[PDB]
């Protein structure tokens, strides 16, 4: 009569690495590294992303005509820019503190687009019909949807002074522009004052702008430039515009709401009718694993990104079917 | 192994035993069969479960982390951000891989330990009433039915009960 002490074995082909030996076959093991995604842009915690399509952030905020107009009010969990955005700044120039504005937008969860300075009603004795071919739409020369090009009316450009009081109860992103003609000829033809100035003030914002006239290399067939500026108008505060030329006035502005865990990503994937708690530019991750090798860029509650190709932890014994 | 048990003086495992990690194979007049030791197996299960749970818990949830943008005159800040991201990545990959390696080694050696411990417990239970025929097997100096084998399994062997007969067959 005999009795024997022995250990488990099975058909497991799971392999794990140790410090002493690589590639050890074992009976039981868990994978700690998520490597699978669904290749889809998904809702994050029930909230759909804000897709800009043909536009980038600048083209959207300025209101580039080549992009399909969004709803007046939107909420999102994250913003998606397409890699190939040919539609952005359509009139050549510099978007001052653009990156900082993006960073601001990274914590914005909602916007309401609204008419801060109504077209015909806010700028009497000024022409509001100015357009350009740099901002084309359906063949015809056009202009930014959220801005207004104020030009001379009847051979005169009276000093304008208008103001808005923020009664929205939220921060209001206000954008405006400064036009810079290539020569003093066009300067006089458009604003009738060779020594013009724009003044924008709030309780904490205070800036003065002066036209800079010089011939420049053509960009998008324009020797002229246009600088774009923005500011966050605090609740209850007043913004005052006071200019005698060269002002690209605000027409629409944005009421912003703040949120958490948002961001801006660049992605190729398309929106599908699905929901996730973790989103990457490549697709959504549905996992409880601590690690992932899918992408460093994440939105939501995600596993820590690593460069590893394999993180398998052994739970069973060394498997020997002998 | 480290304790010389698994892939040692017990060269192979029993695919016939599919209801436990460690266990027994009895052979007597009534027949032969496998039967796992539930105590040490449950212990190992609990320990390793707590280990895995630990490794998972030590990794906090990685919340939202997106890239930033920089203009042509902010190359230094851009490079700094890149250095930060890359550094953290290096460190975390290092930590993950290392941790998994160490824990795997320790786990294997842990199983080795448990097997050898079981063997030693059985051996100390039997004493000189049986002989070690190698391969982690014992040969009895007496008859042993299923009830006797069961008495050995659950840690209740009776030495004085068979000491005389064993002493006889030992000669």
């Amino acid at each position: 009569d005999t009795i024997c002490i022995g250990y488990h074995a099975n058909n497991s082909t799971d392999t794990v690495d140790t410090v002493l030996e690589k590639n050890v076959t074992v009976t039981h093991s868990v994978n700690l590294l998520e490597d699978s995604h669904n290749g889809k842009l998904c809702r994050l915690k029930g909230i759909a992303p804000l897709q800009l399509g043909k536009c980038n952030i600048a083209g959207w905020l300025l209101g580039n005509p080549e992009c399909d107009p969004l709803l007046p009010v939107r909420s999102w969990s994250y913003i998606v820019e397409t890699p190939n955005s040919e539609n952005g700044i359509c009139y050549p120039g510099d978007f001052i503190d653009y990156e900082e504005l993006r960073e601001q937008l990274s914590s914005v969860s909602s916007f309401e687009r609204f008419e801060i300075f109504p077209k015909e009603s806010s700028w009497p004795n000024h022409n509001t019909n100015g357009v350009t071919a740099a901002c084309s739409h359906e063949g015809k020369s056009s202009f930014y949807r959220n801005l207004l090009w104020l030009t001379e009316k009847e051979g005169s450009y009276p000093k304008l002074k208008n103001s808005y009081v923020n009664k929205k109860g939220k921060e209001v992103l206000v954008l405006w522009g400064i036009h810079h003609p290539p020569n003093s000829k066009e300067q006089q033809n458009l604003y009738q004052n060779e020594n013009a100035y724009v003044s924008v003030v709030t309780s904490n914002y205070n800036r003065r702008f002066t036209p800079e006239i010089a011939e420049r290399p053509k960009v998008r067939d324009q020797a002229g430039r246009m600088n774009y500026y923005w500011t966050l108008l605090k609740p209850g505060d007043t913004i005052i515009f006071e200019a005698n030329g060269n002002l690209i006035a605000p027409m629409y502005a944005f009421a912003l709401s703040r949120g958490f865990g948002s961001g801006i990503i660049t992605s190729n994937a398309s929106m599908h009718e699905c929901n996730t708690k973790c989103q990457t530019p490549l697709g959504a991750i549905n996992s409880s694993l601590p690690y992932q090798n899918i992408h460093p860029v994440t939105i939501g509650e995600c596993p820590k990104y690593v460069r590893s190709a394999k993180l398998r932890m052994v739970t069973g014994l060394r498997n020997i079917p002998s | 192994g480290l304790f010389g048990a698994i892939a040692g003086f017990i060269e192979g495992g029993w695919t016939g035993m599919i209801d436990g990690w460690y266990g027994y194979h009895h052979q007597n007049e009534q027949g032969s069969g496998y039967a796992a030791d539930q105590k040490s197996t449950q212990n190992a299960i609990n320990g390793i479960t707590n280990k895995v749970n630990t490794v998972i818990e030590k990794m906090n949830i990685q919340f939202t982390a997106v890239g930033k943008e920089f203009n042509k005159l902010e190359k230094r800040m851009e490079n700094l951000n890149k250095k930060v991201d890359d550094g953290f990545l290096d460190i975390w990959t290092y930590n993950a891989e290392l941790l998994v390696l160490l824990e795997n080694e320790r786990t294997l050696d842990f199983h080795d330990s448990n097997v050898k411990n079981l063997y030693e417990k059985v051996k100390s239970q039997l004493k000189n009433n049986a002989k070690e025929i190698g391969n982690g097997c014992f040969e009895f100096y007496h008859k042993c039915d299923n009830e006797c084998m069961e008495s050995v399994r659950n840690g209740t062997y009776d030495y004085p009960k068979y000491s005389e007969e064993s002493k006889l067959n030992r000669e």
Partner: peptide
């Protein structure tokens, strides 16, 4: 998580 490798294990 649980390691359900055997059925008698407790959960």
């Amino acid at each position: 998580x649980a390691l359900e490798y055997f059925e008698w294990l407790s959960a």
